[PDB]
Symmetry: C2
Subunit: 215 residues, 2 copies
Amino acid sequence: QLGQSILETERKLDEKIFELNQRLTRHTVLMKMKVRVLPFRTVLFKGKANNDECTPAINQEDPANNCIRVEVYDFIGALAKYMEIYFEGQNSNDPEPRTEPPRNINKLKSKIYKNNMVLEDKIISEVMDRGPNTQPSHNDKVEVFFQKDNVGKYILAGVENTKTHPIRNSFKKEFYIKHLDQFDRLFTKIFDYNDQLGNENYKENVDALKDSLRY
Amino acid sequence: QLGQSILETERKLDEKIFELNQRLTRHTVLMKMKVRVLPFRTVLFKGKANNDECTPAINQEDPANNCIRVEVYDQGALAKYMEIYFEGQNSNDPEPRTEPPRNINKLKSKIYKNNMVLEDKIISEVMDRGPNTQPSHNDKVEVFFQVGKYILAGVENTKTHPIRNSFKKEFYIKHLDQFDRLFTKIFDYNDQLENYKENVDALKDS
């Protein structure tokens, strides 16, 4: 009945997550790029994977780096959330960051320190997806950490998803899809912020813009 | 059975196009923003909808504007363009960065150069009159082939001629993806930019 409709919704959510995870593979481009200009209250670093940590590298444009972290701060110690992309393989032999091909992601870690979403009395505070580019349904490879709102690591494949408690569906729809979407838009913004030089036409009014491209 | 598998693939393609159409609703942020800096071989303008045309406005940051056009250059240099015709009105807030997304009335795409050929016919124009309605909205999609206007719901999609699936996978999905990445890039360039000569100097310094 609605039991497998809850599961049909989950498959629709998994397909959305899968496309979001595919967009994130495009950020290999940031690895060799000098990231000097960042949006407000935003920190980015590159490093090498050491267990479930991305250790920051001394050379931020080192071709040997395999992971990247983006931090977001609040100005209400200030750390609100972060995302670590751990890429598979190696960065190319080409010095140009712009032409860097996308690589599959080994694992994707998210940590939330402030304004966390509560799913049925348990706070989502960390997500580790160990198979983001495998197949849409990979609940077996997703670890979710919950904190009691009034230590707590769960594999998504064991979390309840019934009509009475659609915890997995609530996690994917209400939290994870928007979360992945936001971080993706942020990684892209950082790239555009640093790839302006030699790539931007400056025209005060549309008249002067229209005049330059009339040929 | 492959007949229903051709249709199962189409549903998977329709869901992809639906998410791409949802991303496009976010470009309302560009309306009140002064678009001072653009990527090369690009032209952007904001205007008001007049039938299936977007007329360019005198005031480019006018809250009353409802449509936006992005042109890509290579009869002239024009290669392709996309017009987003937003439903409703822009907010009463002067700040472009906080502008809420709005649903899109119609989405028009025109291709002048390097057009994709689908079974001996070139795709030269697409008008989607219901992009944010439901994933399967073929009734509201007009495709022009080279006068030769076809409603997608009437176009064949069988194992022998999977014309709709070829249109959706080989052309439309990538097309919507690139134009969305372009509208986003334009916003980011103008978000960072403030004196242009001083800004370029400060970016070069770091």
